[PDB]
């Protein structure tokens, strides 16, 4: 679902999930996780994660297989879908608990 961002490097990550802006009233959050069971997901900042990947695909435009060239466009539009404004007065700790 949706989380809270509090402060595992990039190498042991198998899957990463990104929410739309409607799923959590406008926030951009992600889920980092490692591959009975019980997977523990580390939560991350969406815009920084989304912005991270966009930079990767661009930097390697000469290496896109046609499956990634489509991914680039989808990561865009989505990125602009989140309004960084209309966030100054919103409560950032909506999803925090504090022990």
């Amino acid at each position, epitope marked *: *679902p949706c989380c809270h961002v509090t402060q595992l490097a990039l190498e042991n990550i198998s899957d990463i999930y990104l929410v739309s802006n409607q799923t959590c009233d406008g926030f951009s959050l992600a889920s980092l996780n490692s591959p009975n069971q019980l997977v*523990i997901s580390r939560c991350a900042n969406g815009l920084n994660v989304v912005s991270f990947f966009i930079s990767i695909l661009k930097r390697s435009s000469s290496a896109l297989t046609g499956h990634l060239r489509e991914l680039l466009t989808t990561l865009e539009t989505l990125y602009g879908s989140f309004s960084v404004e209309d966030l100054f007065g919103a409560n950032l*700790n909506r999803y925090a608990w504090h022990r």
Partner: antibody, heavy 115, light 113 residues
Framework: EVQLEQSGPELVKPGASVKMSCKAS????????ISWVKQRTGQGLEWIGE????????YYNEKFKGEATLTADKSSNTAYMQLSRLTSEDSAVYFC????????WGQGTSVTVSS | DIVITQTPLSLPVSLGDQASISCRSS???????????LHWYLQRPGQSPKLLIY???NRFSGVPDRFSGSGSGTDFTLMINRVEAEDLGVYFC?????????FGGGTKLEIKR
């Protein structure tokens, strides 16, 4: 979504030992918490001994310290709880719940003590 | 500690009626900052308690729309719109701000005849 499993019921004699296990299986986020509570038949819920398997830090109350201790196993995330020197008034059903809400509860384990 | 008060202790309802349950708190329930940690639970007879509403008025996953939490600060209210059979049981409430959390009395939801 998190689903929990608890130990079977144990018929114990006053002064013996009972160890209950709470196995977590599903999807959650880091630094998650497992809470323990008991209710006597016909009475409400009470104490909230929290344990964080990863962190290991624990928050009991004025009771259930010496009257209880909280262990954990990080390999499978079992979060054990046990208690021996038990009187009559603490025969009850002990519930295990995951989340800060608490979101997901376990079926519970009823331990009845009597000589 | 943080006492808590539910009223009524027993609320007979017919099917289709409307229920209202309050959980008056002893101390304020604000933290960081206007995140009020008040939660509502339902224990159907013979089963484990389950979460209904968390943070005062957020419907947990799987909870129908007829459930709704209200109120703020120190006096709150839970509302069931058109009671169904599967809604009978005991409704507890809890706060998670101050240690210990503490729960409420119960408020049994029963049939009226």
């Amino acid at each position: 979504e998190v689903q929990l499993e608890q130990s079977g019921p144990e018929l114990v004699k006053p002064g013996a030992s009972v160890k209950m296990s709470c196995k977590a299986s599903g999807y959650t986020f880091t630094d998650y918490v497992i809470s323990w509570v008991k209710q006597r038949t016909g009475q409400g819920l009470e104490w909230i001994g929290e344990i964080y398997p990863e962190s290991g830090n624990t928050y009991y109350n004025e009771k259930f310290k010496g009257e209880a201790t909280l262990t954990a196993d990080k390999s499978s995330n079992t979060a054990y709880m046990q208690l021996s020197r038990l009187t009559s008034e603490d025969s009850a059903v002990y519930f295990c719940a995951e989340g800060y809400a608490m979101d997901f509860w376990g079926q519970g384990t009823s331990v009845t003590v009597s000589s | 500690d943080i006492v808590i008060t539910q009223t009524p202790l027993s609320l007979p309802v017919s099917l289709g009626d409307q229920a209202s349950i309050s959980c008056r708190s002893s101390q304020s329930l604000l933290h960081s900052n206007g995140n009020t940690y008040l939660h509502w639970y339902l224990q159907r007879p013979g089963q484990s308690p389950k979460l209904l509403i968390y943070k005062v008025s957020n419907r947990f996953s799987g909870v129908p729309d007829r459930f709704s939490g209200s109120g703020s600060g120190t006096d709150f209210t839970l509302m069931i719109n058109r009671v169904e059979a599967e809604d009978l049981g005991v409704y507890f409430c809890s706060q998670s701000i101050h240690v210990p959390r503490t729960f409420g009395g119960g408020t049994k939801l029963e049939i009226k005849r």
